[PDB]
Amino acid sequence: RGNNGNMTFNYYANTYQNSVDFSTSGILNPLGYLK
């Protein structure tokens, strides 16, 4: 997703191409609510 045109092939592994968050153990929704 994003400004990325390729849709078929990825050479390097995901964990080397991107950063990841280590684990721990449609239409736009609105901001601001009234009740």
């Binding site: 997703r1 994003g2 991107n18 609105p30 601001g32 009234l34």
Partner: protein, 258 residues
């Protein structure tokens, strides 16, 4: 249509609510935050090292101290001065008089569309030469470290230490370009566009974050100390956010009315 604006929440309408009509088709989605920010842009222009350097001292520096200025560039959209983070952007409207002139930088587009409060994204860097047929290299070290300053003697030829190290160093052929991407490596979870805290527990300067950047970059000529030339050289730095995200709304700059 009757409504109350004091409640803060107002529901968006269409033409058909009060008149005869119909709604328009979607169109395109060019406003997506991820798609908007993935474009390279100029950040700063720096000189090229030809010997071992001396990192600039902290800001309370008095006169007479010896160091090298304008050789290092920070990687951060926020304002900076003298290769160190700042809070207020600077500008020399009268280039005259004594004193060293302080380097400055800023990300005009990023702060023109900085509508939020917190930000996070990877970052891809590129460098380009501003001199005809130049040979150079680029070095980098992560946030929260320092640049080693010394040299070694090989065959009676001094060789600066920044040649070697387990943190990336890259070389380019005649007239070539250097490109690579970096991860988000700061200790903080997100980068604060605007801040109002203090880092040190006392004698701190409010609103000055400590580690809001990706790292630091510099360029050098792969030759020994014995070949210090006579003319200065410059390069240009390009950055491009990748897979960006935002977290909390804010306001935009104030466009002054003539």
């Amino acid at each position: 249509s009757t409504d109350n604006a004091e409640t803060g929440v107002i529901e968006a309408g269409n033409t058909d609510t009060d008149f005869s009509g119909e709604l328009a088709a979607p169109g395109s989605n060019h406003t997506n935050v991820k798609f908007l920010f993935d474009r390279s842009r100029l950040l700063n222009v720096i000189k090229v090292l030809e010997k071992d350097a001396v990192f600039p001292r902290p800001f309370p520096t008095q006169e007479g101290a010896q160091q090298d200025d304008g050789y290092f560039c920070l990687l951060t959209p926020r304002p900076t001065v003298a290769s160190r983070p700042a809070t207020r952007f600077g500008l020399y409207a009268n280039p005259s008089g004594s004193g060293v002139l302080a380097n400055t930088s800023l990300d005009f587009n990023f702060y023109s569309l900085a509508c939020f409060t917190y930000f996070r994204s990877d970052l891809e860097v590129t460098v380009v030469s501003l001199e005809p047929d130049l040979e150079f290299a680029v070095g980098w070290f992560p946030s929260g470290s320092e640049y080693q300053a010394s040299s070694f003697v090989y065959d009676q030829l001094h060789v600066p230490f920044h040649f070697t190290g387990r943190t990336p160093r890259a070389f380019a052929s005649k007239g070539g370009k250097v490109s690579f991407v970096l991860p988000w490596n700061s200790v903080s979870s997100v980068l604060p566009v605007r801040w109002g805290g203090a880092s040190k527990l006392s004698s701190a300067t409010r609103g000055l974050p400590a580690h809001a950047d990706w790292g630091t970059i510099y360029a050098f000529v792969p030759r020994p100390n014995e070949k210090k030339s006579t003319a200065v050289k410059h390069v240009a730095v390009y950055i491009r956010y990748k897979n960006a995200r935002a977290w909390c709304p804010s306001m935009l700059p104030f466009r002054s009315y003539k």
